[PDB]
Design a binder for this molecule. Structure first.
Ligand SMILES: C=C[C@@H]1C[C@]1(NC(=O)[C@@H]1C[C@@H](Oc2cc(-c3csc(NC(=O)C(C)C)n3)nc3cc(OC)ccc23)CN1C(=O)[C@@H](NC(=O)OC1CCCC1)C(C)(C)C)C(=O)O
Ligand code: NA
Lengths: 182, 13
């Protein structure tokens, strides 16, 4: 894989409960991908054209804790499992992929970069099988073309007896379809 | 009622 990644934590379990309740986060923001938490689960958000995109089944209808207080969702599509908030200052906006390269790369919450073979518009095969538990918490994470552009975000895993052989994702196209119906 | 919180980030190269 050409692409690499590392993570940096910003908050602990306590300051997260606090920030959750005040909706106000002073921490400086960086990175293409944000690691997000509610009370009951963790997941990922990918910034693309100034919107922080993630899944509904992680974020629900919630606000994002921000510097000027809670940020209201700018896009909400329950049935796509997609939501987006305006990207906080300093998040690194990613660029959409359109060249349609066949081999993709999933970035997990562990900052691992996993080879995927595109099988269709919103489906991708894992060249190498992984535990479901290993992917759990990476919904919202980006699938990248080899150039580092974003093709989609991770939505669900195709799996059997706790082993995942494929990923279902929201193609960067659907993020247009929600924006138009705004 | 609780807002979602950024607890970390991932840097890409
Ligand atoms: C293991 C990792 C995987 C990435 C991951 N995702 C997840 O955990 C996702 C979330 C949920 O899937 C969906 C939820 C909602 C959804 C909408 S609203 C809602 N919840 C609520 O309203 C509650 C508040 C009540 N859920 N909408 C979807 C829409 C889809 O459209 C094509 C596909 C999957 C969806 C189950 N799942 C799966 O990955 C599950 N797989 C699964 O459902 O099979 C998928 C369906 C499409 C391809 C194969 C699994 C691994 C638990 C058996 C994660 O980390 O969260
Ligand atoms: Na890494």
């Amino acid at each position: 894989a050409p692409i690499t990644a590392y993570s940096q934590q910003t908050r602990g379990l306590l300051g997260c409960i606090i920030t959750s309740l005040t909706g106000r986060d002073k921490n400086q923001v960086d990175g293409e991908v944000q690691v997000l938490s509610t009370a009951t689960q963790s997941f990922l958000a990918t910034c693309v054209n100034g919107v922080c995109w993630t899944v509904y089944h992680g974020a629900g209808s919630k606000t994002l804790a921000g510097p000027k207080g809670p940020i209201t969702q700018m896009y909400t599509n329950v049935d796509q499992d997609l939501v987006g908030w305006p990207a906080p200052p300093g998040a690194r906006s990613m660029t959409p992929c359109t060249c349609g390269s066949s081999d993709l790369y999933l970035v997990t919450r562990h900052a691992d970069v996993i080879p995927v073979r595109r099988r269709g518009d919103s489906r991708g095969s894992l060249l190498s099988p992984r535990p479901v538990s290993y992917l759990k918490g990476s919904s919202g994470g980006p699938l990248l073309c080899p150039s580092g552009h974003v093709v989609g975000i991770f939505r669900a895993a195709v799996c059997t007896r706790g082993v995942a052989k494929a990923v279902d994702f929201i193609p960067v196209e659907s993020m247009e379809t929600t924006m138009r119906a705004s | 009622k609780g807002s979602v919180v950024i607890v970390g980030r991932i840097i890409l190269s």
